[PDB]
Amino acid sequence: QVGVIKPWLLLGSQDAAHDLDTLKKNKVTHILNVAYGVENAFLSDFTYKSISILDLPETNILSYFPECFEFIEEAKRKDGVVLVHSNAGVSRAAAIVIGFLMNSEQTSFTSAFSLVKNARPSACPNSGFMEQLRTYQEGK
């Protein structure tokens, strides 16, 4: 099961990313793989971007944002749909989408996390990612 964040932005797991039929039913055009060592299964069928991220509280998730957000926007600009996934999709892909909403809509952490969790109930960034997200764009 995938969560709909925006009409063009989905959040899920590696199993979602491995379901070709469902991806095409969902009008997916772009897949952002922010796990580590998860195979991109359908190379001739979508545009992929892979950015290796580890689900550790000492990983700085904020550092991956410019490249992730560029690709998410590429899909929007092309009038497509991007699935952002990790392995379970609980922590890494959730944190990227939370950050994406904070950055693009200037939304607060608590509002962005609420939106994502409502769409995707499994969303639970690790404690490091959680604290990083709280801090994100404060200065801004």
From Swiss-Prot:
Residues 1-140 form the Tyrosine-protein phosphatase domain. It catalyses: O-phospho-L-tyrosyl-[protein] + H2O = L-tyrosyl-[protein] + phosphate; O-phospho-L-seryl-[protein] + H2O = L-seryl-[protein] + phosphate; O-phospho-L-threonyl-[protein] + H2O = L-threonyl-[protein] + phosphate. GO terms for biological process: negative regulation of JNK cascade; positive regulation of JNK cascade; positive regulation of MAPK cascade; regulation of JNK cascade. Coiled coil: none annotated. Expressed in the heart, lung, liver, and pancreas. The expression level in the pancreas is the highest. GO terms for molecular function: JUN kinase phosphatase activity; MAP-kinase scaffold activity; mitogen-activated protein kinase kinase kinase binding; protein kinase activator activity; protein kinase inhibitor activity; protein serine/threonine phosphatase activity; protein tyrosine phosphatase activity; protein tyrosine/serine/threonine phosphatase activity. The active site is at S86 (phosphocysteine intermediate). Signal peptide: none annotated. Phosphatase activity is enhanced by Ca(2+) and Mn(2+). Keywords: Acetylation, Hydrolase, Protein phosphatase. It comes from the Eukaryota. Its EC number is 3.1.3.16, 3.1.3.48. One of its GO terms (cellular component) is cytoplasm. Belongs to the protein-tyrosine phosphatase family. Non-receptor class dual specificity subfamily. Has a dual specificity toward Ser/Thr and Tyr-containing proteins. This is Dual specificity protein phosphatase 19. It comes from Homo sapiens. The chain holds residues 65 to 204 of 217 of the full protein.
